[PDB]
């Protein structure tokens, strides 16, 4: 970004999600003037962010444990999904931290009976790596969202759908976020840049990872 910061003079940085607005001047090494955000002044509530730490068993839940199965958390997750599929109107989406999380959890969700129930209520439309199938899924999600039978679109927090696709009145009602998207599931490349993030900048491991994790967490909810 330095050359365009070297080249261009009057630039604006704007998003629905930018948080914190200071991590960017730190990493990108640039000067700002009005790092100003605005609150939502409403005459009504209009949305519900909730922290489901616990399940019915009052059990703390996560995808940080593994990218795997632990029938307690999985069935707890299966219980939360099936009841959300019962309550939200047409248009509901969720965001796994990782696709390999999605693939493992979903496969053995069809193993139990959790998938048949949501199949009674709504349509279920998976996110496939080939996006023609994903596109064929997404539009049929929106079409079913604008149609009667509920449409459920399940994707990856780091996947393609979160980048540009919007969820309107009907195309999105209750977003969910199963665990927090993290990447040290994979190898040490983040560690290396994070090390650089640690040595070149005064940015720790967890503060960087939680910032990115909540950067895409914020990216999905809006």
Partner 1 sequence: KKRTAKKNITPYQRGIIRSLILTLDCSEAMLEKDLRPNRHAMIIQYAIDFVHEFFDQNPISQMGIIIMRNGLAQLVSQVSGNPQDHIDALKSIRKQEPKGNPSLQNALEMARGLLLPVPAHCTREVLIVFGSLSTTDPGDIHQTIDSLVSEKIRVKVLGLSAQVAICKELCKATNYGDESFYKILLDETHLKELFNEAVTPLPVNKINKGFTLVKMGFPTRIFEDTPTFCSCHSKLVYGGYFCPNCHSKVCSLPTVCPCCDLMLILSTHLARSYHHLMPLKTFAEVPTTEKFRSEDCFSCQSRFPXXXXXXXXXXXXXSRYRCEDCKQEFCVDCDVFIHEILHNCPGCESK
Partner 2 sequence: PADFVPDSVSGMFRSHDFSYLRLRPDHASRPLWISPSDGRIILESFSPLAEQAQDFLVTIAEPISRPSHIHEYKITAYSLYAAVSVGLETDDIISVLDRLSKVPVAESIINFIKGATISYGKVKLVIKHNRYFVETTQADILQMLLNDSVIGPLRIDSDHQVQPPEDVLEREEEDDDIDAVHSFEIANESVEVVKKRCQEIDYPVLEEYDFRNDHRNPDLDIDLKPSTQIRPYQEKSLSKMFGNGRARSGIIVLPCGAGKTLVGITAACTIKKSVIVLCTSSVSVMQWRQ
135, 146, 162, 183: residue in contact with partner 1 (rule CB under 8 A): 146
Please provide the distance, in angstroms rounded to a whole number, between the alpha carbons at the two ends of the chain.
Answer: 26
Whichever of 62 and 140 has its CB closer to partner 2, that residue is 62
d(CA 110, CA 103): 11
DSSP letter assigned to residue 157: T
Whichever of 117 and 205 has its CB closer to partner 2, that residue is 117
d(CA 131, CA 113): 28
How many helices and strands, by DSSP H and E, does the chain display? 9, 4
The number of residues that bind partner 2 (CB under 8 A) is 10
Does residue 75 interact with partner 2 by CB under 8 A? yes
Whichever of 142 and 216 has its CB closer to partner 1, that residue is 142
- Cβ atoms within 10 Å, residue 150: 22
- Cβ atoms within 10 Å, residue 197: 20
Q: Cα-atom radius of gyration of the chain, to the nearest Å?
A: 19
Q: Give the contact letters, 103-142, x = binds to partner 1 (CB under 8 A), - = no.
A: ------------------xx--------------------
Does residue 89 interact with partner 1 by CB under 8 A? yes
| Minimum separation from the CB atom of position 22 to partner 2 (A) | 34
Q: Summarize as ranges the residues that interact with partner 2 (CB under 8 A).
A: 54, 56-60, 70-72, 75
Q: Summarize as ranges the residues that interact with partner 1 (CB under 8 A).
A: 89-90, 121-122, 145-150, 169-170
């Amino acid at each position: 970004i330095k050359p365009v910061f070297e080249r261009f003079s009057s630039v604006i940085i704007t998003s629905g999600t930018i948080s914190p607005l200071d991590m960017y001047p730190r990493m990108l090494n640039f000067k700002t003037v009005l790092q100003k955000s605005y609150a939502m002044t409403l005459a009504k509530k209009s949305f519900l962010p909730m922290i489901i730490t616990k399940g019915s068993d009052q059990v703390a839940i996560s995808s940080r444990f593994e990218i795997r199965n632990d029938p307690s958390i999985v069935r707890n997750y299966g219980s939360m999904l099936v009841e959300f599929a019962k309550i939200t109107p047409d248009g509901m989406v969720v965001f796994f931290p990782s696709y390999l999380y999605m693939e493992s959890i979903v496969s053995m969700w069809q193993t139990m009976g959790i998938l048949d129930e949501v199949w009674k209520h709504k349509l279920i439309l998976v996110e496939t790596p080939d996006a023609q199938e994903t596109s064929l899924a997404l539009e049929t999600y929106r079409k079913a969202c604008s149609n009667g039978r509920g449409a459920i679109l399940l994707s990856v927090a780091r996947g393609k759908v979160s980048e540009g696709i919007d969820f309107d009145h009907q195309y999105g009602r209750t977003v969910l976020m199963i665990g927090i998207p993290f990447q040290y599931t994979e190898s040490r490349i983040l560690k290396a840049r994070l090390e650089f993030m640690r040595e070149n900048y005064r940015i720790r491991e967890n503060d960087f990872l939680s910032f990115d994790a909540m950067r895409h967490a914020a990216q999905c909810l809006g």
